[PDB]
Amino acid sequence: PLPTGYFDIPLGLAALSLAWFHLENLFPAARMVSDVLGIVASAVWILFILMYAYKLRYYFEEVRAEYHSPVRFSFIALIPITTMLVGDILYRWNPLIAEVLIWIGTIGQLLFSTLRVSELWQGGVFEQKSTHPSFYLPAVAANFTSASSLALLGYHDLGYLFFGAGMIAWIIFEPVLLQHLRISSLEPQFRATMGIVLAPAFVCVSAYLSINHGEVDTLAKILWGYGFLQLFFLLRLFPWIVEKGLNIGLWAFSFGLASMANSATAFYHGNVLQGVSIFAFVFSNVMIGLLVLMTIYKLTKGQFFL
Amino acid sequence: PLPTGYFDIPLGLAALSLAWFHLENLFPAARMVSDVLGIVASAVWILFILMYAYKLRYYFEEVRAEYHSPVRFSFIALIPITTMLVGDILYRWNPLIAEVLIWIGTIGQLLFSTLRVSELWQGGVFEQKSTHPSFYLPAVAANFTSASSLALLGYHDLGYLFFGAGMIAWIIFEPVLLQHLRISSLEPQFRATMGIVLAPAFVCVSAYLSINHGEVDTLAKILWGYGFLQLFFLLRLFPWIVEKGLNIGLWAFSFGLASMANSATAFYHGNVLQGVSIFAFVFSNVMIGLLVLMTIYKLTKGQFFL
Amino acid sequence: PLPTGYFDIPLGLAALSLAWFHLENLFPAARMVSDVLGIVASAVWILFILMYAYKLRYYFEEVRAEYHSPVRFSFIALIPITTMLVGDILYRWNPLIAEVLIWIGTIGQLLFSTLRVSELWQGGVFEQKSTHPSFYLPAVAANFTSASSLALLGYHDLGYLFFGAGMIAWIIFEPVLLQHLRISSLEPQFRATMGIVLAPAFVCVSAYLSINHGEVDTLAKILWGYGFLQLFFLLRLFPWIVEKGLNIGLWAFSFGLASMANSATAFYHGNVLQGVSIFAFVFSNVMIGLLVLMTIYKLTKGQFFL
Numbered sequence: 073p074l075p076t077g078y079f080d081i082p083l084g085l086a087a088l089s090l091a092w093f094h095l096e097n098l099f100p101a102a103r104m105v106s107d108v109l110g111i112v113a114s115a116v117w118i119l120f121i122l123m124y125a126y127k128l129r130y131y132f133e134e135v136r137a138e139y140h141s142p143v144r145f146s147f148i149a150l151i152p153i154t155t156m157l158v159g160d161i162l163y164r165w166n167p168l169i170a171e172v173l174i175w176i177g178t179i180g181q182l183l184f185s186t187l188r189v190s191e192l193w194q195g196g197v198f199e200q201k202s203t204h205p206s207f208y209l210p211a212v213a214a215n216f217t218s219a220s221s222l223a224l225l226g227y228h229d230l231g232y233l234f235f236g237a238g239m240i241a242w243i244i245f246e247p248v249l250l251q252h253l254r255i256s257s258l259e260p261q262f263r264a265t266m267g268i269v270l271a272p273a274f275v276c277v278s279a280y281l282s283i284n285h286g287e288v289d290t291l292a293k294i295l296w297g298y299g300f301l302q303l304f305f306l307l308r309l310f311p312w313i314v315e316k317g318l319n320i321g322l323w324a325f326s327f328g329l330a331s332m333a334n335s336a337t338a339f340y341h342g343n344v345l346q347g348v349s350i351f352a353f354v355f356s357n358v359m360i361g362l363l364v365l366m367t368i369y370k371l372t373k374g375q376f377f378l
Numbered sequence: 379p380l381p382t383g384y385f386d387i388p389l390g391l392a393a394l395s396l397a398w399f400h401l402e403n404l405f406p407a408a409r410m411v412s413d414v415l416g417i418v419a420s421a422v423w424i425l426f427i428l429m430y431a432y433k434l435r436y437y438f439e440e441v442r443a444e445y446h447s448p449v450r451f452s453f454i455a456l457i458p459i460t461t462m463l464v465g466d467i468l469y470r471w472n473p474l475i476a477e478v479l480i481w482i483g484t485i486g487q488l489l490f491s492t493l494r495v496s497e498l499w500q501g502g503v504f505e506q507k508s509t510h511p512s513f514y515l516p517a518v519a520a521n522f523t524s525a526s527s528l529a530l531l532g533y534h535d536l537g538y539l540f541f542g543a544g545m546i547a548w549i550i551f552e553p554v555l556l557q558h559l560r561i562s563s564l565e566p567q568f569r570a571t572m573g574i575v576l577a578p579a580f581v582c583v584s585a586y587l588s589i590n591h592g593e594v595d596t597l598a599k600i601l602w603g604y605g606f607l608q609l610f611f612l613l614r615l616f617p618w619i620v621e622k623g624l625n626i627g628l629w630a631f632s633f634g635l636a637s638m639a640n641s642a643t644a645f646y647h648g649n650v651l652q653g654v655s656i657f658a659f660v661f662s663n664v665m666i667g668l669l670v671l672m673t674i675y676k677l678t679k680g681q682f683f684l
Numbered sequence: 685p686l687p688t689g690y691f692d693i694p695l696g697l698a699a700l701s702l703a704w705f706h707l708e709n710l711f712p713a714a715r716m717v718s719d720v721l722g723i724v725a726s727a728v729w730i731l732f733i734l735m736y737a738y739k740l741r742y743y744f745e746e747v748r749a750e751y752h753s754p755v756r757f758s759f760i761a762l763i764p765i766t767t768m769l770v771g772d773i774l775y776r777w778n779p780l781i782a783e784v785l786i787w788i789g790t791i792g793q794l795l796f797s798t799l800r801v802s803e804l805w806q807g808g809v810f811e812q813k814s815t816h817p818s819f820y821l822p823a824v825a826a827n828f829t830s831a832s833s834l835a836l837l838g839y840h841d842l843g844y845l846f847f848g849a850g851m852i853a854w855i856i857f858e859p860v861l862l863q864h865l866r867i868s869s870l871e872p873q874f875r876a877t878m879g880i881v882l883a884p885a886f887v888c889v890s891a892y893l894s895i896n897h898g899e900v901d902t903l904a905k906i907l908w909g910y911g912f913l914q915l916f917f918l919l920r921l922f923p924w925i926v927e928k929g930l931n932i933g934l935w936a937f938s939f940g941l942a943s944m945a946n947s948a949t950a951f952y953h954g955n956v957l958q959g960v961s962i963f964a965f966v967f968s969n970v971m972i973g974l975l976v977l978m979t980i981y982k983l984t985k986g987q988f989f990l
């Protein structure tokens with residue numbers, strides 16, 4: 073009965089493993105860094121999956137309440153997302169086990185959204201105050217992750233379907249999210265979830281480049297531009313985001329940061345904006361590094377688990 | 379003085395005729411099916427046009443009230459949409475008459491939206507509760523239909539202008555529609571119009587493929603992906619949609635369903651996702667078939683016309 | 685302490701200079717027209733920059749209040765936008781001075797938005813009634829202008845980043861703007877700002893064509909289509925827009941009109957929709973001409989400056 077959002081941790085580490093993996097053909101030593109990150113992410117995922125299985129068996133009413141909440145349900149999508157990313161890692165060692173994880177995560181996230189995201193359209197449960205960045209997780213991030221994982225398995229055209237579902241879902245949600253943020257101050261207890269606002273453009277372009285064989289084209293450049301705009305905005309907002317202190321919820325940023333790193337490797341490979349690429353890759357790794365150090369610190373104080 | 383929404387019937391049948399037409403170069407027997415559907419759609423259109431002319435002549439205040447309503451006005455767009463689709467059918471037999479119908483429908487829908495859709499921006503008439511799926515008809519569907527009909531006539535670049543008007547209008551409306559649906563439960567009397575939510579992506583890709591010579595490219599695949607997401611959501615929602623019983627308003631689904639079928643023929647021709655294409659084509663035909671059987675049933679009970 | 689919105693005047697004239705510049709390779713006499721417009725725009729810009737410097741030095745609390753307003757802040761973005769366009773003009777005579785102006789305007793607009801646009805997401809200051817067309821200026825128009833100016837300097841890939849920031853920001857804002865306009869009647873004192881609604885698609889395609897070497901492709905045609913839809917809507921709305929009389933605020937239309945003219949030159953060069961291109965170019969010049977005549981008239985009556 074771990075907090076569900078703690079899945080952000082293996083998610084970010086797994087995505088960062090994949091970014092480093094994609095540098096191996098330029099810098100062979102990147103593979104060891106990728107492998108270490110990937111093993112740590114997989115180990116943490118195993119632990120957190122077992123904990124969540126325990127929650128389901130013995131704390132089921134807590135899961136039921138999170139599921140039916142028009143806000144909290146979204147974090148459940150971190151489970152299949154991380155499952156797919158761990159599959160993508162494991163593909164380097166065992167394509168069969170990888171493929172199983174990728175399909176479980178894909179079928180699971182699609183079933184999840186089909187059951188819950190659509191149900192919101194019945195009205196009367198979701199309220200204006202439910203308009204939170206976390207909605208990107210089931211609606212957008214899960215589809216991008218399926219897109220890139222299916223492309224890894226060779227299913228590029230199926231990947232494009234998931235890609236399009238995520239990209240259009242993103243464009244369709246974000247307008248109402250930013251209008252809500254403008255009007256209604258997001259309370260401090262939820263502010264770390266502003267980190268999820270960094271994700272869409274970077275997760276999108278990373279998935280796109282995964283499906284299109286790494287071709288850095290006009291769409292990719294357009295996505296990077298909006299991604300950087302959002303990064304600058306969130307940097308400016310950071311003191312406000314952490315008004316009430318640093319917390320583990322800041323791992324919400326790691327998905328976007330890791331996807332910035334991953335897409336940077338493709339831009340670099342493609343000889344597009346190489347200087348920006350190096351900055352992005354270094355910046356994202358430093359920030360995730362700080363998240364790791366803050367987390368080790370909290371673990372040493374017994375301030376990690378609830 | 380038929381209900382204006384009954385134009386959904388010849389619309390769906392006409393769009394389905396065109397889908398079958400596009401299979402003739404793979405399966406010659408498809409032409410007869412296409413021709414039968416096209417004749418039935420054209421006959422029903424003639425009847426309903428004559429009925430609406432009678433409404434205009436002798437029930438004009440009812441038309442005036444529907445026109446000025448910030449909700450009901452949208453269904454009027456079914457008239458030029460169906461007019462264009464009937465033109466597209468008739469092109470196989472008489473390109474001159476077809477071209478006349480296509481221009482009448484194009485000029486008519488553009489004049490309609492220019493007069494009424496823009497007027498909404500004056501404020502104070504449209505209310506939050508006016509945010510209904512039917513708004514897609516004048517704002518989106520009409521433009522896509524002009525795009526594809528103009529391309530049939532050889533005006534591809536003009537078609538792209540209409541295409542872009544519809545595509546961007548879609549992306550610009552849908553965000554606020556889905557947020558409204560999430561917050562406000564759509565009352566049962568309007569719920570069959572949820573079928574219109576299926577239309578945008580499928581109508582969009584069908585129009586796109588009509589203009590771009592059937593090239594199944596990245597944009598087409600992206601559109602199909604979001605289209606299928608919406609289909610799955612609407613399937614899950616179907617029991618809720620029909621909470622208060624099956625009704626003729628369910629023909630609102632037929633535009634999206636027929637456009638799923640039409641786009642499937644192009645995907646199949648292009649050897650992209652052929653299995654998905656077959657499923658989509660068969661599914662859409664079965665559902666429209668059920669709509670026809672339910673309609674024959676209602677006609678036999680004298681429960682069709684008001 | 686001129687009204688900040690008066691920067692619309694050199695902006696529109698500068699953008700129109702650039703449109704004529706782009707016709708020189710088809711009609712050599714266009715260069716003189718371009719040069720005259722460009723000199724007049726630059727002269728007016730110099731004057732208004734000096735006036736605004738005087739406002740900053742001696743009326744600073746008025747600037748501070750406009751800056752912190754969640755509505756009025758946007759007009760400040762006209763300053764760096766016009767600065768960049770004047771740089772683009774001056775490039776024909778002095779690339780070094782041009783490049784300085786272009787970077788000042790680019791760094792300035794990016795810093796401006798990063799500081800102010802993001803701050804809105806803290807909530808509680810911006811209200812639903814703050815949802816005005818002027819928000820396009822910092823959020824959208826400034827990024828497009830950087831995109832095209834950077835491309836002029838040879839920085840095409842950097843230009844694409846700014847382009848994408850503007851294009852996605854546009855799509856993300858417009859949904860909530862049009863919903864607001866539908867529900868809430870914009871008061872007459874702000875209605876001339878409806879002219880800014882014309883800008884996005886035309887500014888977007890003009891910037892795009894500047895970066896992509898004038899290739900009139902599917903995206904360009906799609907953008908033009910939505911642009912024309914918006915033009916038709918605004919033409920229909922014009923009597924309402926000017927309900928309370930003609931005023932200098934109507935220069936808000938000139939950015940979109942000039943960008944219609946500029947993009948028309950590219951469509952014409954590309955042999956796409958040449959007839960539409962000629963109409964667009966002539967229409968936009970006539971309307972800006974009328975704005976100039978109305979302005980000379982007001983200056984002769986001493987009804988220009990506050």
Ligand SMILES: CCCCCCCCO[C@@H]1O[C@H](CO)[C@@H](O)[C@H](O)[C@H]1O
Nearest residue numbers: 128135136137138139140148151184
């Ligand atoms: C990882 C995702 C966890 C899923 C939690 C499921 C919550 C479902 O919950 C329940 O399902 C029943 C039907 O099975 C209904 O009768 C209950 O009323 C409903 O609450």
Ligand SMILES: CCCCCCCCO[C@@H]1O[C@H](CO)[C@@H](O)[C@H](O)[C@H]1O
Nearest residue numbers: 139152180181183184185187188191
């Ligand atoms: C990882 C995806 C598995 C999620 C299974 C959860 C669904 C539990 O069952 C379903 O959930 C619905 C919520 O929409 C409930 O209303 C209903 O009980 C049921 O349809």
Ligand SMILES: CCCCCCCCO[C@@H]1O[C@H](CO)[C@@H](O)[C@H](O)[C@H]1O
Nearest residue numbers: 289290291294851852901902903904
């Ligand atoms: C929501 C934002 C979507 C922007 C879509 C970008 C359009 C893609 O742009 C297309 O990309 C191709 C590859 O570079 C080019 O050859 C085309 O000419 C270009 O228009």
Ligand SMILES: CCCCCCCCO[C@@H]1O[C@H](CO)[C@@H](O)[C@H](O)[C@H]1O
Nearest residue numbers: 095333336337338340349350351353
């Ligand atoms: C995704 C960005 C990560 C790529 C890391 C690049 C670090 C390499 O650094 C680069 O090495 C080149 C040769 O290899 C030298 O020519 C360059 O000057 C240097 O900048």
Ligand SMILES: CCCCCCCCO[C@@H]1O[C@H](CO)[C@@H](O)[C@H](O)[C@H]1O
Nearest residue numbers: 434441442443444445446454457490
């Ligand atoms: C198929 C579309 C039907 C169009 C219905 C038109 C409704 C117009 O209605 C009327 O138009 C008059 C001007 O002509 C105004 O004076 C009326 O007050 C206005 O209601």
Ligand SMILES: CCCCCCCCO[C@@H]1O[C@H](CO)[C@@H](O)[C@H](O)[C@H]1O
Nearest residue numbers: 445458486487489490491493494497
């Ligand atoms: C098929 C398209 C024909 C529609 C003609 C209907 C317009 C009737 O006339 C117009 O309608 C306006 C509504 O915006 C009314 O306000 C005005 O009477 C008029 O401008």
Ligand SMILES: CCCCCCCCO[C@@H]1O[C@H](CO)[C@@H](O)[C@H](O)[C@H]1O
Nearest residue numbers: 239240289290291292595596597600
């Ligand atoms: C709102 C969603 C719009 C997504 C735009 C998809 C961008 C189109 O994508 C472009 O398509 C071409 C044809 O396949 C490719 O060659 C380009 O490389 C690809 O980016």
Ligand SMILES: CCCCCCCCO[C@@H]1O[C@H](CO)[C@@H](O)[C@H](O)[C@H]1O
Nearest residue numbers: 401639642643644646655656657659
């Ligand atoms: C749009 C989808 C409709 C296309 C219908 C396709 C039905 C044909 O069926 C297909 O026929 C092929 C040869 O013709 C066989 O090779 C395939 O195995 C079979 O699936």
Ligand SMILES: CCCCCCCCO[C@@H]1O[C@H](CO)[C@@H](O)[C@H](O)[C@H]1O
Nearest residue numbers: 740747748749750751752760763796
């Ligand atoms: C061209 C743009 C004009 C910028 C106007 C800046 C307004 C800033 O204003 C002020 O800045 C101070 C810090 O410097 C704060 O202490 C003040 O309280 C804040 O109002």
Ligand SMILES: CCCCCCCCO[C@@H]1O[C@H](CO)[C@@H](O)[C@H](O)[C@H]1O
Nearest residue numbers: 751764792793795796797799800803
């Ligand atoms: C042309 C761009 C220069 C603009 C400088 C204005 C910023 C003045 O300073 C800044 O403005 C903030 C507004 O977000 C204020 O809250 C703070 O005083 C400060 O961060």
Ligand SMILES: CCCCCCCCO[C@@H]1O[C@H](CO)[C@@H](O)[C@H](O)[C@H]1O
Nearest residue numbers: 545546595596597598901902903906
């Ligand atoms: C928000 C609207 C975005 C629409 C994106 C348009 C997709 C661009 O379209 C792409 O353009 C290329 C250049 O013409 C073509 O070769 C591709 O086949 C076409 O899909």
Ligand SMILES: CCCCCCCCO[C@@H]1O[C@H](CO)[C@@H](O)[C@H](O)[C@H]1O
Nearest residue numbers: 707945948949950952961962963965
């Ligand atoms: C951007 C649109 C502005 C372009 C102005 C075009 C005016 C030229 O006019 C055109 O000249 C051609 C030869 O030069 C003649 O063949 C054409 O018939 C004529 O229409």
